[PDB]
Design a protein around this ligand. Structure first.
Ligand code: UT4
Length: 124
């Protein structure tokens, strides 16, 4: 298992927006309490889950805890960059698993909830 994705960067700037703020306090919290959050609340432990070549196939591991700690650190550039990390998290799951499997069903239920929540987002 590689190190978890970065949460800070010295060469990268920091800002917050009313949208990012909505992503943390509303979107991320909504998903975080979803029934199916827990496989995604922390980086995938490919070792202990026995995922073959997980980190060869998945070149951008993403997870809601990395998202979370990024949002609290205002690591992100804008709401766009944060949504994309969410999108990466679901996509990673559809790339690595057979369509129809439990985990994919779970990512799909989180994604649909995610989608409805991102419509509540204002444009800055
Ligand atoms: O793409 C993934 C592939 C699967 N599998 C596990 C079972 N064989 C089929 C492939 O597992 C995950 C997880 C995950 C699942 C269960 C967890 C978990 C993470 O962490 C806490 C303990 O239970 C996040 S993505 C992802």
């Amino acid at each position: 298992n590689p190190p978890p994705p970065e949460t800070s960067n010295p060469n990268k700037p920091k800002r917050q927006t009313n949208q990012l703020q909505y992503l943390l306090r509303v979107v991320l919290k909504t998903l975080w309490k979803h029934q199916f959050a827990w496989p995604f609340q922390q980086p995938v432990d490919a070792v202990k889950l026995n995922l073959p070549d997980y980190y060869k196939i998945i070149k951008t591991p993403m997870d809601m805890g990395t998202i979370k700690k990024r949002l609290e650190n205002n690591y992100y550039w804008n709401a766009q960059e944060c949504i994309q990390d969410f999108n990466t998290m679901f996509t990673n799951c559809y790339i690595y698993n057979k369509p129809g499997d439990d985990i994919v069903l779970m990512a799909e239920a989180l994604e649909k909830l995610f989608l409805q929540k991102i419509n509540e987002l204002p444009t800055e």
